[PDB]
């Protein structure tokens, strides 16, 4: 029985442009990557600062099928994304969060 | 970010 | 940082009638009830062997406003619903899983 | 041709929680259950008072295949579920509704 | 306490085009017109014949402020629409079923 | 490589209901109808100024397989359809806005 | 009144993951990069040869506010995204496209 | 269709 | 709730 | 609406 | 089920 | 890709 990390999506504006700064448990600011050393989950929570009605939609990767990440929850209200690594496939991947916003109809990505 | 695992 | 548990819910047919049998990770069947220690999550994995094409679609509560879970998410494909219990309220909350189907427009919920 | 019954589902708050109370065409509380002794349909219309936001999403049933309700209805707004009772098949069902509210993103179900 | 009437929308293709025929309780063909004397409900049942996955998406209306339908309620399987009419607005209304179907993004209309 | 047009639908109330008057790009209040002489796209774009809520669900067609209209593009605000034609096939098609409204549960259509 | 231009998204499994391979109007094979010299729409039509069930959901944004796109649409069947590109502000935007697929439930981004 | 309302 | 049928 | 093709 | 909060 | 904007 495995891990459950908490992670915080805190997005800012900056020249009129979304910045993500990833925040752990302790309230520091971390990098965003994890390394999963056992079956667990991770549980991503939006802190939308940015006045513009951000929800998450979904989580998104370039390498979809690389099962690094066997699946994603997502909240009704679109504040929590949740990531399932069952931890059996080796490698890594890399994502980006996808978000709808409320000033207009494109989705939103964070840094791939 | 990026996601790396271990088993 | 907390306990990812994973629980697998297997539905069969029996008199006509959903069935609802909880497996845990060593695959012994379980009451379905569980206990958190610290903050984290439970994983619900559908094993939907009625044949009657069932999603989850949500969970749901008769005092949702407890405050012992604090967010359900759920995946696209409805096989998966994850609770979030970051353990800062304590108490007992009972729920039920409510699912679609596909032979008929009714909502399919686990016993109280 | 059959009888369209009209109930209203009243939501209050007690001690932080959902308090279902139903209401018939007189105004005259009733206890909820409805005996159908002909082909028709029988309207629920929601009266939120518990400033939570709550919407139908739907009509739960453990014994969702017994086939006493034939078909659930839901408006785009969720103020209103109908259920469709063609009353083919003789026996009893007990129901619960499934809805959303705006607090949190757990689904609400009134009492089994 | 009032009229539960129930009306069977049957689609053919004729000319690769869709037509509808409306079928009262006994069998009979109907113009598919009503009149309502009480508080009540209409209920559309679909019977697509015409192999293009006809789903009703909702009822429309040129005059949709008029108040002679107070609410339109559907199925999560588009089979059903029900109207409700509280009868208390005198007065006519005409309307068009609005559907999905699998051929093309396009919706279908009954005729005006 | 063809034609965008640009054509918006403004939306008024008179005597308690909607009136569609449409715009051309000069500002010029046009009919309505197009010619499409070579494939491209008709971009409509909703002014709703009846303070009802609208937003465009779909374009229906009574004759939806006429191929006239190859397809029908929506924003997930509701603001923008756009339909594609290819132009391949000959002939014309009528039809109508179907739009959801925040008053009611019932859908609006512009003018058959 | 403007330019309506077609690009076929082609995508195909290599190495078990998604490639994206876009063909312009005369079937050539295009970088997928465009010019607007004035207000108007390109749209996009998926050929999806990865038997993986994929759908528009989306085009994203890393610089979702920088103007340069004013609208996105999308079709119900999630074939078809169109771009609207008024051609007011001058610039550069990068986007990706975000899809959904059956095997499992991350979403899909085409390269960034 | 049309619906008549008669109350 | 309950729902009783007698056709 | 009406629309007319022409190809 | 049941789910039991003991922080 | 990348679109690219010129009034």
């Not at chain 1, 390498?63 to 066997?70: E, L, N, R, V």
């Given at each position: 029985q495995g891990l459950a990390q908490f992670i915080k999506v805190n997005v800012t504006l900056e020249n009129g442009e979304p910045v993500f700064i990833f925040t752990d448990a302790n309230g520091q600011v971390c990098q965003g990557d994890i390394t999963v050393t056992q079956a667990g989950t991770i549980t991503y929570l939006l802190n939308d600062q940015?006045?513009?009605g951000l929800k998450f939609v979904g989580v998104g990767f370039v390498?979809?099928?690389?099962?690094?990440?066997?699946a994603v929850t997502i909240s009704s209200d679109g504040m929590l994304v949740q990531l399932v690594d069952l931890d059996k496939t080796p490698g890594t991947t890399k994502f980006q969060f996808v978000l709808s916003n409320t000033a207009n109809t494109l989705l939103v990505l964070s840094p791939d | 970010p990026q996601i790396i695992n271990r088993p």
């Open positions: 940015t006045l513009k390498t979809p099928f690389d099962g690094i990440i066997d | -």
